[PDB]
Amino acid sequence: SVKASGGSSLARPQLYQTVPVSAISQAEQQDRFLEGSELNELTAYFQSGALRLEIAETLTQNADLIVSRAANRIFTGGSPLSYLEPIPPGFRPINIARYGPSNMQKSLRDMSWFLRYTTYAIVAGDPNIIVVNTRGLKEVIENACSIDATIVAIQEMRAASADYFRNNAQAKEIVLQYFDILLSEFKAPTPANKVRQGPSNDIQGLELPQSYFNAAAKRQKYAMKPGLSALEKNAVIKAAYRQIFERDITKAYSQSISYLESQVRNGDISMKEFVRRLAKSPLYRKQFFEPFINSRALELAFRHILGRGPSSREEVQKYFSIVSSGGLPALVDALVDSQEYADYFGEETVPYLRGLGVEAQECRNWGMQQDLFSYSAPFRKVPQFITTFAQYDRPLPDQHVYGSGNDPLEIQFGAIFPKETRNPSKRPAPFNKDTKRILIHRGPAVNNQVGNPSAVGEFPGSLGAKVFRLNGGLPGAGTSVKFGESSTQALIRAAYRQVFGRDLYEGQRLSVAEIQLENGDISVREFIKRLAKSELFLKLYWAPHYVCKAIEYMHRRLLGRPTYGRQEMNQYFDIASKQGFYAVVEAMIDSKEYSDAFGEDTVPYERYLTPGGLQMRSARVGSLREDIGQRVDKEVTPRFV
Amino acid sequence: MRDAVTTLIKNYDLTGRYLDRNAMDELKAYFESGSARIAAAAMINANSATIVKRAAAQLFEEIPELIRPSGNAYTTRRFSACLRDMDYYLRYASYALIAADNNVLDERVLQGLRETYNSLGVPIGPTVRGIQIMKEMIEAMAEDSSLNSTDFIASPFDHMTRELSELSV
Amino acid sequence: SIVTKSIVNADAEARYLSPGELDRIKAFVTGGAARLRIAETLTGSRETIVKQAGDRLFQKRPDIVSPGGNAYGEEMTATCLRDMDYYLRLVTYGVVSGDVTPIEEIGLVGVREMYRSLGTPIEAVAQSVREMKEVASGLMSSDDAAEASAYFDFVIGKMS
Amino acid sequence: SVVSQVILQADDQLRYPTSGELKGIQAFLTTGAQRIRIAETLAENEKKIVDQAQKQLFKKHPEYRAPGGNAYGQRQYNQCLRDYGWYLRLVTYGVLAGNKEPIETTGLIGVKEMYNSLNVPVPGMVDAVTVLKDAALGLLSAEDANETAPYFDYIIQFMS
Amino acid sequence: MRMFRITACVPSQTRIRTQRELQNTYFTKLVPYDNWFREQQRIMKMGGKIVKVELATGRPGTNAGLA
Amino acid sequence: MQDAITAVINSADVQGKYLDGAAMDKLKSYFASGELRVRAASVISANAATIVKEAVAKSLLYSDVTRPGGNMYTTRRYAACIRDLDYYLRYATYAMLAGDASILDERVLNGLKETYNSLGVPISSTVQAIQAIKEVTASLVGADAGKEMGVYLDYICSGLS
Amino acid sequence: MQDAITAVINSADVQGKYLDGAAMDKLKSYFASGELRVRAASVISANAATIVKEAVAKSLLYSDVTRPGGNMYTTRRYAACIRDLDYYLRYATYAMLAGDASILDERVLNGLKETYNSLGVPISSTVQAIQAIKEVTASLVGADAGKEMGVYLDYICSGLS
Amino acid sequence: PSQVAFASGDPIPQNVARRTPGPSLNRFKEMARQVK
Ligand SMILES: *[C@@H](C)[C@H]1/C(=C/c2[nH]c(/C=C3N=C(/C=C4\NC(=O)C(CC)=C4C)C(C)=C\3CCC(=O)O)c(CCC(=O)O)c2C)NC(=O)[C@@H]1C
Ligand SMILES: *[C@@H](C)[C@H]1/C(=C/c2[nH]c(/C=C3N=C(/C=C4\NC(=O)C(CC)=C4C)C(C)=C\3CCC(=O)O)c(CCC(=O)O)c2C)NC(=O)[C@@H]1C
Ligand SMILES: *[C@@H](C)[C@H]1/C(=C/c2[nH]c(/C=C3N=C(/C=C4\NC(=O)C(CC)=C4C)C(C)=C\3CCC(=O)O)c(CCC(=O)O)c2C)NC(=O)[C@@H]1C
Ligand SMILES: *[C@H](C)[C@H]1/C(=C/c2[nH]c(/C=C3N=C(/C=C4\NC(=O)C(CC)=C4C)C(C)=C\3CCC(=O)O)c(CCC(=O)O)c2C)NC(=O)[C@@H]1C
Ligand SMILES: *[C@H](C)[C@H]1/C(=C/c2[nH]c(/C=C3N=C(/C=C4\NC(=O)C(CC)=C4C)C(C)=C\3CCC(=O)O)c(CCC(=O)O)c2C)NC(=O)[C@@H]1C
Ligand SMILES: *[C@H](C)[C@H]1/C(=C/c2[nH]c(/C=C3N=C(/C=C4\NC(=O)C(CC)=C4C)C(C)=C\3CCC(=O)O)c(CCC(=O)O)c2C)NC(=O)[C@@H]1C
Ligand SMILES: *[C@H](C)[C@H]1/C(=C/c2[nH]c(/C=C3N=C(/C=C4\NC(=O)C(CC)=C4C)C(C)=C\3CCC(=O)O)c(CCC(=O)O)c2C)NC(=O)[C@@H]1C
Ligand SMILES: *[C@H](C)[C@H]1/C(=C/c2[nH]c(/C=C3N=C(/C=C4\NC(=O)C(CC)=C4C)C(C)=C\3CCC(=O)O)c(CCC(=O)O)c2C)NC(=O)[C@@H]1C
Ligand SMILES: *[C@H](C)[C@H]1/C(=C/c2[nH]c(/C=C3N=C(/C=C4\NC(=O)C(CC)=C4C)C(C)=C\3CCC(=O)O)c(CCC(=O)O)c2C)NC(=O)[C@@H]1C
Ligand SMILES: *[C@H](C)[C@H]1/C(=C/c2[nH]c(/C=C3N=C(/C=C4\NC(=O)C(CC)=C4C)C(C)=C\3CCC(=O)O)c(CCC(=O)O)c2C)NC(=O)[C@@H]1C
Ligand SMILES: *[C@H](C)[C@H]1/C(=C/c2[nH]c(/C=C3N=C(/C=C4\NC(=O)C(CC)=C4C)C(C)=C\3CCC(=O)O)c(CCC(=O)O)c2C)NC(=O)[C@@H]1C
């Protein structure tokens, strides 16, 4: 299996172009309101909409007759309509019995599909769907379908469809034009795939069918040339700022480097040199270098200069070495001077985000590049490409099965989880249903229940946490100065500190449960069950959290350990689905392991830690032992003394 | 990328060990299989387009929903993309056959593949079935031809099948 | 490895293996036997190779084993011979793989920084590898020695 | 040839070629006699090879010579024969060079663009190359045919 | 809620404990009705000897008004 | 979580201010729509299983998702997908009653994307499922309640996407 | 992004059916409202600066948000906030013209919470300011066009919660 | 003026058909045609 995930976000490639999408994207890619041009296109399209819907209505109503005329002209020797799901020199009618039922079905389906997508294109106001799905259909069906026959069928459908529109040269011309586009595109040979060759030996080569590119939204490309009008040069410079700085900081904050802009618009420097000097500038330094560690800064720089994220472990390694050696100038120079940069953008073209639809995409950095291209990329500080690439090459991490965000801090009290949206740090990993998380026992290592399952309940002594037990008798099981009042109350407060992490404020303690415990009417287990099921516990630790975060924190408090994996998590989560919070608490406290580790008289306690929690506790300067992770030299007095 | 020799060397360097008898035997096995591996790669090169086309046709015959409305091979755009993906799998399977090591598939095919298909809604199961169809076609082709060793052929395809497919049991 | 180089090149071009790459892989496969023989010789004679080469280095370069020298003292000299053993092992790796890639990856990327950090004169490390090359060449036939000397020379050139 | 490929790879990394690259160069420069004889044998037999290939193709695709077909008309037919001969010449170039570069730079990059502009079907071209492969390999020894087949296969793979 | 008042004796197999364990062995405790099936199974399958079960709180034959 | 009333109260309390007229009119707006929310919630509570069933039947059944090799194949995974849909519908109704999506942001979305990318649950297919739930519920509770429930189901989808 | 035509066409196509009556009904509603939606978009574009000025004055100015320690205090933060308000107005206009909120899903609500939670921008204050923008636009374009823009501004607002 | 209402207007519910067994069940369909 795969050992890491770069994340997966919903991908929405454009299937085809429509007039409103075209206009609105034209305005939106330039970071502006729709102007007279786009608004006028929208007005004209909306005005034509009534006629277009009339065309679509008449064609869908009479689609049967049009398809029947096509099928009758194309086929001979039988009735093609028995089952419904100008003349090329080589055309000859096709025999129904010979041609076969499956291929006849595909013929009728294809004719109807052509008419259907023609109506779709009429309504959309753009033939892009027809071009996309018809250029290269010929070669797809040459070997089982006659091209001359298909051409004649499409011509018959075109004539029959236009026959319903003697109205005037408004409906007829549109129908004829869209059918002519369909005809010329079916006659088209398959265009070659767009090849994205690997810039080096650590990056694979890919190719994309040209139809995929034609469907996707086209990336607007800005190129600085000497002859452009001043307004065009302004647009190009704004695009350069939007690319390098991720937004128009000149519009937002009047931030700009005027002499660089004058040089680039004069042609003194190329757009490539302008990009180089802008990315070296103190503006860029302050915005996308100073706030980040070098590892994240280089990923952002790849976005800004190349329009893509890192492609491999070797690439991040190489460029992190470069930034370690020469800092931001070295990084920018290496990126801008790369053969890849000149291959895509050359000297004049403003760099653009490539991504899905612009060229063939790699699986290895899919999710990471999705995240990188978001406008929220500057607020991820944790590197995503080096982390994920390294984790590909290594076994599964120490991490909750549902992700790093589901691991709370292993502190005395509080349910502190990383927030998915705040400083995004998510680290998805594919844990299947059967993985078991390695936990560190708080006590003698050999008492870990994995290797010593009968060690369960063995108190850890000095190596582990303090354990509170109702070993002594309870009071009144009259006289004052009965010593059995201090131990029972110490245990009650210990149980409060265990279930909630810390002691409650005055008025919050479940006094009835406390007296019912102090009177021998219940057991310690029953009392902690009451504490766990209390409305206070619900409000504090169940209600404010993701269901599985609440369950995980609950498990740590009640069983004294994190969950091992998907088996425990799934059972508690399923109970949460079916029954609710009280039933989840019941399941945890009525489980066999609770009974083994804790009887009816033991307050639960921390029995295990994750590696991360132990490292948090024992890796600080004041707690780090001298022999851990270093060579301990024996000191001996010099022999000359 | 790691081939069989690089994998062995990594294993031995991890422990700082010189290559011993077992290492030499494994290297010998790879070198003696090299001719058969080269022949299998050449045969795939001679039939890659037809292999892909026939495998896709068989898959769409086995799962007709793929080329019907709401199927992920529906429309020529998606159909072409699907045949493209099949071509990818065959090319990288040929690489893996030559290398006698599936790490090339792990590094350049499988890592992040589930994420991409989930993002696009591409159905994994039919893709795995298509991989298996191509595997069977390659095996039959190798059997028909004058090739001596053909047991290694299944290894890459099965690997992809195991790495990408959902865990059922 | 030769196979990996050919495969990554073909992948970079997004194509199947070309006839030239298949020819190179065929040559690699056919030369496997001689490469394994050379590696077997180097591994079998590793102790004597390292001892003789270290003797020649120390007698030729006594300063590194003289007081103030980097390898001065019994333990430092032992560590120097340990490094020589490391590089011989890497040479055997490169010999069987047919390329210098394992040697680069394990023992030459950042070697300068490491040995500058340790204070070891890198030129003397290059000389130690030279001594090992000279000792190994005597243990095999001329063609085998020529094939192994290329890996030794790659190490030497990267050192100095 | 493989020498140019080695030099390109070495220059891209700003280094001298490694031992393995030079060994591959040596093997290629030794098989030159076989490459030369294959090129010559294919050269003088161009007419027979093309005749067999073209009759086979137009048996496979009678539509091309039929009215409305791309090859219909003596001029178009002769141009197709010219194309057969030219691609056989490219195959000999590739055989001599030891790699696909002379073929690919001359008659594969942009080939779909060219033939689409001429309405010559690319699948017609791949069938044509397949029959040319069969005819040409028929006129070669078993070992020479095995050596020269992957070049035809490469043209076929690029064509579609 | 219905509450039983269960008395049980739990023996100690597999371990000779040296700490005070009498409280765990022969105990009388209030159990909610809903948990009594599970608790009966747990005490039994542990080796316990449930001496007595009574309906401390609640009534028999109650169709409504039990919570 | 916070509902619309609590949103107003928190906005007033963070400034130490008594409720002024604008806060009162926001509370009046919430009270005006509360009857609609209660009726829509009642209909959805009655029909939850049926909305989920019809949305699954209109979006996921007889597709690659349920066939061998799909993430909804095997009965354990099928039940898992239905369970997730039950959560989404129920929490959308909760938020709709509250008038605020806060409960979704805290119970549902804070960790779910990482969870789904860890498990390999496809987000395109589940977004399609939640959209189908959107249309089914919009058919049951009517126009206004349909749009209001829409808002929060679309919220779940956007949080997933 | 997807507009209304794409949504209707994809719904028809995924089922392999021609454009039916309900599809044509929704499409003709879109086409009939198109002219007035274009006019509303033109008016909003002509008054974006004034709209944002008045919304800021109503909702943000002279509050804890603009004073020292408030998230809008410094000049850079003020300019960034009014720029964000302009973003919300523009993308609401895009959604109105397209007749669908997909642009808001993929270009706005993608990591809006990531951005604001990471920077600690006050969400309640942003929602109040967007409500002010909606009110100002409604006063400027008209009550019905105001509602048409208000559905999308409310969509962004609910996305913030 | 009210004609501008599209997203604010009365929603126009669209027909989405419940999915039915595709051709992958053809054999069983035949078995269903021969089970009566
Ligand atoms: C239909 C909705 C799609 C689908 C769903 C699906 N989900 C799972 C598994 C899990 N889903 C969850 C969900 C949550 N955790 C929470 O805390 C919350 C509450 C806010 C939710 C909604 C979890 C925790 C799991 C994992 C459970 C476990 O430990 O097993 C599956 C099964 C995946 C598996 O590998 O078993 C499925 C199928 N899948 C699709 O394909 C539909 C589009
Ligand atoms: C005399 C100086 C000129 C003048 C001033 C004037 N300013 C405002 C309103 C505001 N001024 C600021 C400015 C700042 N806030 C900051 O944090 C910083 C940096 C420390 C600056 C410079 C702000 C934010 C406001 C908004 C009010 C608020 O505090 O919330 C006004 C009021 C304008 C109005 O119509 O409300 C005025 C009058 N006006 C002139 O004509 C003088 C030239
Ligand atoms: C007024 C609206 C509130 C406010 C705003 C505020 N925002 C920021 C910073 C940023 N806002 C964004 C948001 C977007 N960028 C986009 O491209 C889009 C999608 C269309 C959105 C929604 C971003 C990315 C930033 C930071 C980077 C940038 O400048 O683009 C700030 C500054 C925060 C800081 O501490 O620097 C502020 C002040 N703050 C309030 O208090 C108002 C309630
Ligand atoms: C003002 C006294 C006279 C004048 C000026 C004028 N200059 C330009 C255009 C350019 N000026 C420069 C000069 C520089 N750019 C730099 O970065 C620096 C180095 C620090 C200098 C000195 C350049 C490069 C240009 C061209 C690009 C640009 O516009 O920035 C114009 C505009 C010309 C046009 O055709 O648009 C003008 C008006 N013009 C007069 O009539 C005055 C006598
Ligand atoms: C030395 C005392 C310990 C040690 C170090 C070690 N580190 C790496 C690799 C990397 N270290 C970093 C570090 C940083 N990234 C940043 O942005 C910054 C902030 C300024 C730092 C310090 C990175 C990014 C890497 C990865 C580089 C790469 O891509 O190769 C290694 C090598 C790991 C590997 O697999 O190559 C090592 C050895 N290791 C120890 O044992 C010491 C205790
Ligand atoms: C007081 C000088 C400042 C202050 C404090 C403050 N803290 C919280 C909340 C928590 N404090 C903790 C702390 C700890 N947990 C541990 O395990 C340890 C070691 C034993 C410590 C120190 C935790 C975890 C929380 C959250 C959980 C809980 O509160 O029980 C608050 C309340 C925050 C809230 O609303 O949740 C406050 C006010 N605040 C100030 O302004 C002072 C400067
Ligand atoms: C022995 C060759 C080396 C060594 C070992 C060592 N280990 C520990 C402590 C632990 N070991 C484990 C390991 C596992 N637990 C599991 O469940 C599994 C999966 C099957 C493994 C591999 C764990 C988790 C611990 C922590 C304690 C616990 O057992 O729960 C120690 C003790 C460390 C300490 O400081 O106490 C030691 C010494 N140490 C060496 O030097 C050897 C090279
Ligand atoms: C031949 C006289 C008639 C015919 C038959 C036919 N079609 C196929 C296969 C396919 N047809 C399509 C069609 C389309 N793709 C689109 O996107 C659209 C809208 C523009 C259409 C109409 C596709 C995708 C295929 C391939 C997948 C499949 O089998 O469905 C065949 C079989 C080909 C084979 O080699 O097996 C046949 C026989 N099509 C015509 O147009 C003629 C009327
Ligand atoms: C065919 C058997 C199946 C199928 C395929 C299909 N795939 C896509 C789109 C993509 N496929 C990939 C996959 C890869 N890219 C790589 O670099 C590699 C590693 C070598 C792989 C395997 C990617 C990344 C995409 C998206 C980018 C692109 O197009 O290049 C589609 C189109 C999806 C859509 O509609 O947008 C299709 C149809 N479809 C099936 O039904 C089969 C199961
Ligand atoms: C020895 C002289 C006689 C004898 C002893 C015997 N005892 C048991 C079982 C138990 N004994 C106790 C008693 C105590 N446990 C305490 O904690 C304290 C209070 C501080 C006392 C007095 C208990 C509680 C048990 C049961 C629980 C347990 O043993 O852990 C047995 C029975 C053994 C069994 O498992 O059946 C026996 C044999 N028996 C004789 O015949 C001697 C005369
Ligand atoms: C026959 C004995 C009974 C019966 C069956 C019946 N089933 C369905 C629909 C489905 N059946 C399944 C079952 C499975 N999917 C799996 O992955 C597995 C595990 C290996 C099983 C068993 C599923 C998931 C469906 C949903 C449709 C689909 O495949 O996508 C129906 C149709 C129900 C409907 O309305 O769609 C029927 C009729 N019906 C009876 O009355 C018998 C008792």
From Swiss-Prot, chain C:
Subcellular location: Cellular thylakoid membrane
Name of one Pfam family that matches: Phycobilisome
PTM annotation, UniProt: Contains one covalently linked phycocyanobilin chromophore.
UniProt-annotated binding residues for (2R,3E)-phycocyanobilin: 80
Any one Gene Ontology cellular component term annotated for this protein: plasma membrane-derived thylakoid membrane
Gene Ontology terms describing biological process: photosynthesis
Keywords (A to Z) from UniProt: Antenna complex, Bile pigment, Chromophore, Electron transport, Membrane, Methylation, Photosynthesis, Phycobilisome, Thylakoid, Transport
Entry-linked Gene3D superfamilies: Phycocyanins (1.10.490.20)
Membrane topology of the entry: Peripheral membrane protein
Positions carrying N4-methylasparagine: 70
Subunit architecture: Heterodimer of an alpha and a beta chain.
Family classification: Belongs to the phycobiliprotein family.
Its job: Light-harvesting photosynthetic bile pigment-protein from the phycobiliprotein complex. Allophycocyanin has a maximum absorption at approximately 650 nanometers.
Name of the molecule in the record: Allophycocyanin alpha chain
Protein's organism: Synechocystis sp. (strain ATCC 27184 / PCC 6803 / Kazusa)
Underlying gene: apcA
Curated annotation (Swiss-Prot), chain D:
Keyword Thylakoid appears in the UniProt entry: yes
SUPFAM superfamilies attached to this UniProt entry: Globin-like
Modified residues (N4-methylasparagine): 70
Subunit structure, as described in the record: Heterohexamer of two alpha chains, one alpha-B chain and three beta chains.
Gene source species: Synechocystis sp. (strain ATCC 27184 / PCC 6803 / Kazusa)
Positions of (2R,3E)-phycocyanobilin binding: 80
Keyword Oxidoreductase assigned: no
Deletion consequences: Increased levels of phycobilisomes (PBS) and photosystem I (PSI), decreased levels of photosystem II (PSII) per cell. Cells are unable to undergo state transitions. When combined with an ApcF deletion mutant the cells have decreased PBS, PSI and PSII, and require glucose to grow.
Membrane topology: Peripheral membrane protein
GO cellular component term, pick one: plasma membrane-derived thylakoid membrane
Gene3D superfamilies with a match to the protein in the record: Phycocyanins (1.10.490.20)
Protein family: Belongs to the phycobiliprotein family.
Keywords noted in UniProt: Antenna complex, Bile pigment, Chromophore, Electron transport, Membrane, Methylation, Photosynthesis, Phycobilisome, Thylakoid, Transport
PTM (free text): Contains one covalently linked bilin chromophore.
Biological-process GO terms, alphabetical: photosynthesis
Protein name: Allophycocyanin subunit alpha-B
Subcellular location: Cellular thylakoid membrane
Swiss-Prot record, chain E:
Compartments (UniProt record): Cellular thylakoid membrane
Family classification: Belongs to the phycobilisome linker protein family.
Statement: the UniProt record of this protein carries the keyword Thylakoid: yes
Domain CpcD-like: 1-56
Protein name, entry field: Phycobilisome 7.8 kDa linker polypeptide, allophycocyanin-associated, core
A cellular component term, taken from the record's GO annotations: plasma membrane-derived thylakoid membrane
InterPro entries: Allophyco_linker, Allophyco_linker_chain, CpcD-like_dom
Membrane topology recorded in Swiss-Prot or TrEMBL: Peripheral membrane protein
Example GO BP: photosynthesis
Keywords: Antenna complex, Membrane, Photosynthesis, Phycobilisome, Thylakoid
Keyword Membrane: yes
Function: Rod linker protein, associated with allophycocyanin. Linker polypeptides determine the state of aggregation and the location of the disk-shaped phycobiliprotein units within the phycobilisome and modulate their spectroscopic properties in order to mediate a directed and optimal energy transfer.
Gene for this chain: apcC
Protein origin, superkingdom: Bacteria
UniProtKB/Swiss-Prot annotation, chains F, G:
Residues that coordinate or bind (2R,3E)-phycocyanobilin: 81
Modification after translation, per record: Contains one covalently linked phycocyanobilin chromophore.
Main location: membrane
InterPro entries per record: Allophycocyanin_b, Globin-like_sf, Phycobilisome_asu/bsu, Phycobilisome_asu/bsu_sf
Domain of life: Bacteria
GO CC term, one of those recorded: plasma membrane-derived thylakoid membrane
UniProt keyword Membrane present: yes
Record membrane topology: Peripheral membrane protein
N4-methylasparagine modifications at: 71
One GO BP: photosynthesis
Pfam families named in the record: Phycobilisome (PF00502)
Gene3D superfamilies on file: Phycocyanins
Subcellular location: Cellular thylakoid membrane
Function: Light-harvesting photosynthetic bile pigment-protein from the phycobiliprotein complex. Allophycocyanin has a maximum absorption at approximately 650 nanometers.
Protein family: Belongs to the phycobiliprotein family.
Subunit details: Heterodimer of an alpha and a beta chain.
Protein name (Swiss-Prot/TrEMBL): Allophycocyanin beta chain
Species of origin: Synechocystis sp. (strain ATCC 27184 / PCC 6803 / Kazusa)
